[PDB]
Structures are given as C-alpha cells and as structure tokens.
C-alpha cells in the first residue's frame, strides 16, 4: 500500500568510491604540455643562418 | 656494357670459369633541373615543400 524506499547499500560509499585527483592533474598537465607546438611548420628549410 | 659484365661465362668446371666482377656503376638522373644549368631548384626560396 506504500511506495518502497530505496537507499544506498549497507557498506559506506566513500570506502569504494575514494577521492584522489592525481589522475585528473596528470591529464591536465599532459594537455598543457601538448598545448605548445611540437611539430615543424618549415620542412625543407635548414634553419641554420649563414655564419 | 663494358664487354666484361655481359660476356657469357660457363660453369666453374668448364673452360670459362671467370667470375663476374663486382664494381660501382653510375646512372645520372635526367630531371628538369638537371637538363639545363639555367633551371635549378630554389631550395632557399622553397622553405615549405619537401622534395
């Protein structure tokens, strides 16, 4: 005659879910590193000026 | 076609047992820039194309 109430499991959530931002900081650092240009846009140049 | 590399040689047990010599041969490459001195590739002018 009443709507059943559903909640979380018996075990606490935090022990399983945990919290450690090392992965996301690693991703952000990798993205910031890749933001700078790493390829060459002057092929067949020889960018050494004459002495 | 040095009259030595194209001369037939029988097996080692026959009268002709000379081995075909190993040496260096040169082949010029006929290209548009190689055909005339007035036509030369401006590598200094082309810093964006790889040849």
Tokens matching residue B6: 């194209």
Contacts of B47 in chain A (CB under 8 A): 42-45
Q: How many helices (H) and strands (E) does chain A have?
A: 2, 0
Residue A13 backbone phi and psi in degrees, to 5: -70, -40
State this model's resolution in angstroms.
Answer: 3.5
**Pick among A42, A44, A49 to test the B interface (most B CBs inside 10 A):** A44
Label residues A7-34 b or e (16+ Cβ within 10 Å = b): eeeeeeeeeeeeeeeeeeeeeeeeeeee
Please answer yes or no on whether B43 and A44 come within 8 Å at the CB atom.
Answer: yes
Tokens matching residue A44: 């067949």
Q: Tell me how close the Cα of A34 comes to any Cα of chain B, in angstroms.
A: 23
Give the whole-angstrom CA distance, residue A31 versus residue A23: 12
Length of chain B: 51
Task: State the structure-solving technique.
Answer: cryo-EM
Nearest to B30 by CA among B42, B39, B22: B39
């Amino acid at each position: 005659t009443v709507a059943p109430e559903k909640h979380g499991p018996v075990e606490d959530m935090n022990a399983i879910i945990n919290a450690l931002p090392t992965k996301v900081d690693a991703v952000k650092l990798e993205y910031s590193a890749s933001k700078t240009n790493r390829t060459n846009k002057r092929p067949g140049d020889g960018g050494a000026p004459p002495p | 076609n040095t009259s030595d590399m194209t001369n037939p040689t029988p097996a080692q047990g026959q009268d002709g047992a000379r081995t075909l010599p190993s040496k260096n041969l040169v082949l010029p490459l006929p290209f548009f820039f190689s055909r005339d001195c007035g036509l030369a590739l401006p590598t200094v002018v082309l810093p964006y194309n790889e040849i």
